[PDB]
């Protein structure tokens, strides 16, 4: 029974991942074939770049603005920078914008989406000049809607680029997010790659490879069938007609970009993900903040599940993959929970050692593929993501399920999960307190657990050596620290 369950877990985890790898590779081949036909110095889609932010680091906001300005795309109509706030502290963003761009900061007294006349011409007069708006703080959706209306008042603008206030774009990110829109009349959105640059912490180092996997594999797989989720945010291109069609139902809903993407998909429109457009953002360095962020992400995903399933019904035989993935995530969560619960109350050393060895092996295979794809030996740190998942995501999923003092609603379930895991480990240790070197099964269990501990210790020591030698830092991170030292 235990062997059958472990084999089922192994196949269930390593078969969908292999299928996703194959689909992402085929999406990469399709996009490469599309790009190989792109004429040199191609600029046919007029683009307005939208930056929506709220009290970002003055250094990182300046880096984002400079990365936008230092972009090689030849057809950029305008830059729209919307700031969720007109308070005294929110003027720092305007000052940074004036440092990097013109003195066209506007402070309307109203939020554009909460007015009888929502046209961008009510708060703007010239579409040629880059614009900065200081609008009252309502949310990411309201600032994004103001940016959409400011971009839509120029009839010559064909597409729109959404980036975060902290995204350091590559010199060809805009070109590679806007090119796929012209390769298919039914493609109304493109998702770009987001890369974590601040790999100076054990959590951020693993979150960087989690982002790499979840973008490359898990979005090329969706883009093969052209049903990518969560487009926009750090980097994403939207056609102007589709946003003109879907902005009102999206803003009048009773910012995660999930509902915007589902509004695109519910109308039968294709969405691709390009791995050749890269924008650099950061990740939380704190475990607890990561826990609350993942709780919010899981709450958003669980809220937009019926709408996602309905969206993956408008595609005749496509969208079956989207529905299968939506069911697979739930089935995987409950499979992991059931496996841990079963092997935790039985206190069988053979089963626990087999489970940890199989999980380590499958994560080693996944990390090997990640290293091959990224050409980076640091992708083997992803074997340590098992701890991050088991100790931050499962509490996050349970909290999202249960919440849909302020400390209790955020961390009580996490602390209870930690206490339960500790109690299960202690019970398994005290229920199997014996030594028998004459038994081959006990020898196998002890040697397996000791080898697993030695492996994880060696990986941790390698990470520590890299941290001391600053070998874990991305080149952009080294550049950013060097720039910060002297401002």
């Amino acid at each position, epitope marked *: 029974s235990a062997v059958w369950g472990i084999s089922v877990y192994g196949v269930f985890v390593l078969g969908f991942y292999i299928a996703q790898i194959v689909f992402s590779e085929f999406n990469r081949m399709r996009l490469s074939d599309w790009i190989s036909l792109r004429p040199d110095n191609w600029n046919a889609t007029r683009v307005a770049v939208i930056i929506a932010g709220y009290r970002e680091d003055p250094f990182m906001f300046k880096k984002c603005l400079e990365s936008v300005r230092d972009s090689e795309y030849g057809n950029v109509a305008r830059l729209i920078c919307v700031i969720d706030g007109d308070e005294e502290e929110d003027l720092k963003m305007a000052e940074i914008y004036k440092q990097v761009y013109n003195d066209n900061v506007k402070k309307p007294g109203v939020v554009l989406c909460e007015s009888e006349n929502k046209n961008g011409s009510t708060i703007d007069s010239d579409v040629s000049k880059n614009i900065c708006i200081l609008q009252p703080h309502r949310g990411k959706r309201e600032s994004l809607y103001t940016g959409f209306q400011l971009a839509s008042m120029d009839p010559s603008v064909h597409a729109v680029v959404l980036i975060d206030s902290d995204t350091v774009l590559e010199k060809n990110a805009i070109l590679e997010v806007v090119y796929p829109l012209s390769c298919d009349p039914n493609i109304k959105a493109v998702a770009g790659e987001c890369k974590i640059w601040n790999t100076d912490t054990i959590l951020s180092m693993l979150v960087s490879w989690r982002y790499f996997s979840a973008f490359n594999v898990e979005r090329g797989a969706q883009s093969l069938w052209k049903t990518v989720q969560c487009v926009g945010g750090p980097l994403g291109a939207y056609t102007i007609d589709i946003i003109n069609e879907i902005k009102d139902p999206w803003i009048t809903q009773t910012g995660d970009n999930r509902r915007l993407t589902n509004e695109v998909l519910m109308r039968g429109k294709k969405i691709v993900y390009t791995p050749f457009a890269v924008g650099w953002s950061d990740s939380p360095t704190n475990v607890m903040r990561y826990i609350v962020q993942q709780t919010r992400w899981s709450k958003s995903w669980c809220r937009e599940i019926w709408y996602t399933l309905g969206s993956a019904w408008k595609h005749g035989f496509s969208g079956i993959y989207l529905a299968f993935e939506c069911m697979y995530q739930i089935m995987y969560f409950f499979l992991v929970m059931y496996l841990f619960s079963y092997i935790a109350i039985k206190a069988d050393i053979r089963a626990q050692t087999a489970t940890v060895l199989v999980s380590t092996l499958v994560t080693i295979i996944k990390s090997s593929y990640l290293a091959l794809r990224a050409k980076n030996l640091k992708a083997f740190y992803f074997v340590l993501y098992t701890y991050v998942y088991f100790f931050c995501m499962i509490p996050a999923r349970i909290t999202a399920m249960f919440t849909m003092w302020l400390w209790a609603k955020q961390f009580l379930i996490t602390y209870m999960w930690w206490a339960g895991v500790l109690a299960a480990g202690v019970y398994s240790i005290v229920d199997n307190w*014996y*030594f*028998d070197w004459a*038994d*081959i*099964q006990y020898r196998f269990a002890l040697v397996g657990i000791c080898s697993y501990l030695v492996f994880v210790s060696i990986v941790l020591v390698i990470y520590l050596i890299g941290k001391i030698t600053t070998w874990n830092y991305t080149p952009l991170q080294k550049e950013l620290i060097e720039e910060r030292y002297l401002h």
Partner: nanobody
Amino acid sequence: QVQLVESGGGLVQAGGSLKVSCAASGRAFKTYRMAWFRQAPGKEREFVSGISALETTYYADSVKGRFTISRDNTKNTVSLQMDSLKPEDTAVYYCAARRYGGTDYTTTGSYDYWGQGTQVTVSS
């Protein structure tokens, strides 16, 4: 520590069967490797059979295909089923238990908790 009390025995004619049971009155029986030893009237103790904490059956020579050892952990017992007796199998059968031990499961000194012994005899 486990206190081992043994049952079974009696007389068998030839080519028959028997069962010897050993109940342990300790605390954590499922962690104890158990063993059955025989002592001939004019010889020393010999390892006959054994079962590990994770069930793994060991049998000696002239015993592999005839005996069968099992353990119950709900009722803390270890049982040896001698399904084919020969006149050489007339010996006192003891049960031994251990929790911590090395590679040697055969020597009398490998097990620290011992039973009293049930006389098992077969007459021609």
